[PDB]
Amino acid sequence: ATFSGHGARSLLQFLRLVGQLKRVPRTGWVYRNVQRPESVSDHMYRMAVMAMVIKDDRLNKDRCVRLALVHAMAECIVGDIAPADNIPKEEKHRREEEAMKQITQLLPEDLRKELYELWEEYETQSSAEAKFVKQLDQCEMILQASEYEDLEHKPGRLQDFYDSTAGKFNHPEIVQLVSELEAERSTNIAAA
């Protein structure tokens, strides 16, 4: 119940917290000694483009793009928690929830409600759009894994990331895209 107001100063401060996403490297790459790992905002950027180009006539894509730009936003405060950090699901949720409250309080009421709603939709996976964006997250991530493998000239190195997405995919377009990716990568591995 803070007293920072909802003027330009608070909007600016909201924007600074958001910019901290540029300086949160994605932890999974850090823990695997990737040189120059992407930021969390790098990751959401490509998810957002993927929402634009991976087709599904049943989905509101404007909402999918917004879910993509908002879903990881709490990491500007809580940091990027990876499976290796062993934070229980409930504790990660509680931290990120508190963070989103703090962040959105800087915005006028209608904007606060809208952003928080989007975050809540994603976190509870309550819509088809939310579930779609969750698979973009996982897809975009193994794509980036294979790109770090290519850049390193170390085919297969980041195998653990592929294994962790086993059976997490069921959207027919993303499923198709993943299968193509795994086939191209598993070919490169055999070549080497």
Residues that bind a copy of itself (CB under 8 A): 6-9, 11-12, 14-16, 18-19, 21-23, 36, 38-39, 41-42, 44-46, 48-50, 52-55, 62, 65-66, 69, 107-108, 111, 115, 143-144, 147, 176-177, 179-181, 184
State how far the Cα of 5 lies from the Cα of 107, in Å rounded to an integer. 9
Among 69, 137, 155, 169, binds Cl ion (CB under 5 A): 137
By CB under 5 A, which span of 53-61, 68-76, 99-107, 112-120 interacts with Cl ion?
68-76
State how far the Cα of 155 lies from the Cα of 101, in Å rounded to an integer. 42
Least spacing, CB of residue 72 vs Cl ion, in Å: 4
Phi, psi (deg, nearest 5) at residue 172:
-55, -35
Least spacing, CB of residue 31 vs a copy of itself, in Å: 18
State how far the Cα of 151 lies from the Cα of 36, in Å rounded to an integer. 11
Partner touching 174 among a copy of itself, Cl ion, none, CB below 5 to 8 Å by kind: none
Angle between helices 109-123 and 61-70 (to 10 degrees): 90
Q: Does residue 133 contact residue 71 with C-beta atoms inside 8 Å?
A: yes
Of the pair 96, 137, the CB lying nearest Cl ion is at 137
